[PDB]
Structure 1
Amino acid sequence: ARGLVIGEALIDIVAEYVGGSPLNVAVGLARLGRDVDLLTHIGRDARGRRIAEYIESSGVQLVSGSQTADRTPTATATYAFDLEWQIPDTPPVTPPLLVHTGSIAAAREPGCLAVAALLDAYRAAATVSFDPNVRPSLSADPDLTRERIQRLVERSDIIKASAEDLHWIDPTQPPEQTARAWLACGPAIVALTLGDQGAVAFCAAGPASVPAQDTVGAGDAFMAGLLDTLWEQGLLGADRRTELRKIGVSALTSALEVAALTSALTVARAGAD
């Protein structure tokens, strides 16, 4: 029962904090009590040391080859990015129960090709989950990254996205339209957060929703709570792919509720301080 997360860890400079949407998911799952491996790309500099200690002090096992970057990637607040995404293409862990990726790691060369490869590798053993987490302020080529997202959708079992992500993906369509088009491409579950309007999700059995419950990391905490409940329902792992697709509306609604409340609790505990 191990999870594998592949994606960027970085430093958010406003003062500086440890960030990266794939890192937040990894640390979110571990805080919830799961065994998580994190393949990433940080430095051996002061930042990459603070990142590695933040990872270590969270229970997330840092996969070897993750500290090979020249400089530790940074996001300086509308965001300015100085980052390189590249990871060893060799499968570094015993095949996990779950492989999760998204954000910059899924769409940025040269790591994005290895990630899609690695995803293709572990897919026969692991459930694939993905969060596009569109950060347009990072470089560009909108068509390439729009196309790479669409190809990861086609490879994925579980998808979570925000209405803002899907509006970037296709402004001509309501985000529910886009999410339903994504479900038709293969996934068992497409979850859609709607900010002040709550969250909805779609599976073959039907739509689910949770009502209205904007700070950094709320989306990744939602994703972690989603994967953790699906894990707890016994639907992760390729062994359980066929019943992931068959999840009932009541189960999905309850996974959605837990993910929405997990995200809200992470916000409220961060607002207390």
Structure 2
Amino acid sequence: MLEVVTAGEPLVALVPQEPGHLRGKRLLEVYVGGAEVNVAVALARLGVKVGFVGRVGEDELGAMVEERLRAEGVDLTHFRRAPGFTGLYLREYLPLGQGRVFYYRKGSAGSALAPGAFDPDYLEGVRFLHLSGITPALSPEARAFSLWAMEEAKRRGVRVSLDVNYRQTLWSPEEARGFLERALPGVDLLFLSEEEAELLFGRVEEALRALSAPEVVLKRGAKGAWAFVDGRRVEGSAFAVEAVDPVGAGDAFAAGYLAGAVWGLPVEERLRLANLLGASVAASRGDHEGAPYREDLEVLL
């Protein structure tokens, strides 16, 4: 039976093989990405029974997504190729670090997602349903879907996990704020970064007061992070490693924290776990390439 279920829009990442401006490259590497996706994979790699829900176009890129998911062991009960196209994007990491991103996903088969996108009973018996603030920002359908989705998970005694992920590209801090204030009630687990808190509540302080979910984790760059449960605030291990491709650590981290919880581990181990994931993906090129496999933890144990 599935332990975790996530949902979102899959995207294909195109990335240069080395730092520098995209304008100058002539060879791009192809990777499969998408927050929720990055997360499903990570979990899948750790032995967690997880299912992904989403759509992709009936194009070669869609096929690729599917193969990849299927290969990783993700449950695609409610995932399929549909008329339309698959969203993709181009990335570029500058020498001194200033990255920039370009999207080509508006109107993709995957950005459809509307309430009822799958059969709710799917959620039954499941531990968690994870989502990203990116999905609801795509379209009003999605927005609705999202609300609908956790509503249903709640209704089924399924824990709702949410990684804020504010994309200025998709919407305003006000809209984002509006969304959250409407959504928070149904959230049990929330993932957030400092910038995001600052950028939407002025200070990482107010944000906490406002968004007081049962459990909230705050990513704080390389300064570890803090977990907030039972009025308690455990701090996580900070990491002195340099980013290779920090483009998916955020998701890896969450996944990591998720796996811990799914295994009913003390907040300390969950964090520990989460950085471990984040670290690994950050240390590798690709959205979720670098995500470790269960047997790795085992040896590392």
Q: Sort the TM-score into its range (normalised by shorter chain).
A: 0.7 to 0.9
In structure 1, C-alpha distance between the alignment counterparts of 2:234 and 2:123, rounded to whole Å: 34
Partner of residue 80 from structure 1, selected from 98, 102, 110? 102
Query: Residues 9-158 of structure 1: matches in 2 within 5 Å?
Result: 9-14=10-15, 15=28, 16-64=30-78, 66-68=80-82, 70-77=84-91, 78-83=100-105, 84=107, 85-90=111-116, 91-92=118-119, 93-95=122-124, 96-109=126-139, 110-124=141-155, 125-138=157-170, 140-158=171-189
Q: What is the DSSP-based 3-state SS (H/G/I as helix, E as strand, rest coil) of the residue aligned with 2:222?
A: helix
**Residue type of the partner of 1:257?**
R
**Residue type of the partner of 1:197?**
K
**Is the CA contact 1:79–1:137 (under 8 Å) kept in the aligned structure 2?**
no
Aligned to 1:240: none
Aligned to 1:197: 223
C-alpha root-mean-square deviation of aligned residues, in Å?
Answer: 2.3
**Residue type of the partner of 2:112?**
Q
Q: What is the DSSP-based 3-state SS (H/G/I as helix, E as strand, rest coil) of the residue aligned with 2:55?
A: coil
**Is the CA contact 1:127–1:157 (under 8 Å) kept in the aligned structure 2?**
yes
**Is the CA contact 2:123–2:158 (under 8 Å) kept in the aligned structure 1?**
no
In structure 2, C-alpha distance between the alignment counterparts of 1:269 and 1:20, rounded to whole Å: 16
In structure 1, C-alpha distance between the alignment counterparts of 2:205 and 2:83, rounded to whole Å: 39
In structure 2, C-alpha distance between the alignment counterparts of 1:65 and 1:37, rounded to whole Å: 9
Say if 1:141 and 1:207 are closer, same or farther in 2 by CA, change over 3 A: closer
Structure 1 position 176, deviation (Å): 4.2
In structure 2, C-alpha distance between the alignment counterparts of 1:159 and 1:222, rounded to whole Å: 12
In structure 2, C-alpha distance between the alignment counterparts of 1:70 and 1:8, rounded to whole Å: 13
Partner of residue 214 from structure 2, selected from 162, 174, 188? 188
Say if 1:75 and 1:178 are closer, same or farther in 2 by CA, change over 3 A: same
**Is the CA contact 2:173–2:199 (under 8 Å) kept in the aligned structure 1?**
no
* Structure 1 residue 212 corresponds to structure 2 residue 238: yes
**Residue type of the partner of 1:82?**
Y
Say if 1:94 and 1:192 are closer, same or farther in 2 by CA, change over 3 A: closer
Deviations 1:90-127 (A, max 9, x none): 24215122111113213332222012112101213200
Gaps of 5+ in 1: 235-250
Aligned to 1:267: 282
Deviations 1:169-209 (A, max 9, x none): 22x21x244134312xxx22100111121111111231110
**Is the CA contact 2:7–2:131 (under 8 Å) kept in the aligned structure 1?**
yes
Aligned to 1:237: none
**Is the CA contact 1:107–1:149 (under 8 Å) kept in the aligned structure 2?**
no
How many equivalent pairs are there? Answer: 251
**Residue type of the partner of 2:57?**
G
Structure 1 position 65, deviation (Å): 5.2
**Is the CA contact 1:65–1:87 (under 8 Å) kept in the aligned structure 2?**
no
Aligned to 2:6: 5
Q: What is the DSSP-based 3-state SS (H/G/I as helix, E as strand, rest coil) of the residue aligned with 1:101?
A: strand
Structure 1 position 270, deviation (Å): 5.2
* Structure 1 residue 178 corresponds to structure 2 residue 204: no
In structure 1, C-alpha distance between the alignment counterparts of 2:12 and 2:225, rounded to whole Å: 29
**Is the CA contact 1:130–1:153 (under 8 Å) kept in the aligned structure 2?**
no
Structure 1 position 210, deviation (Å): 1.5
Q: TM-score, normalised by structure 1?
A: 0.84
Q: Which structure would you say has the larger Rg?
A: 2
In structure 2, C-alpha distance between the alignment counterparts of 1:88 and 1:129, rounded to whole Å: 19
In structure 1, C-alpha distance between the alignment counterparts of 2:193 and 2:228, rounded to whole Å: 14
In structure 2, C-alpha distance between the alignment counterparts of 1:67 and 1:141, rounded to whole Å: 31
Say if 1:201 and 1:111 are closer, same or farther in 2 by CA, change over 3 A: same
Moved over 6 A (4+): none
Q: TM-score, normalised by structure 2?
A: 0.76
Aligned to 1:245: none
**Is the CA contact 2:236–2:272 (under 8 Å) kept in the aligned structure 1?**
yes
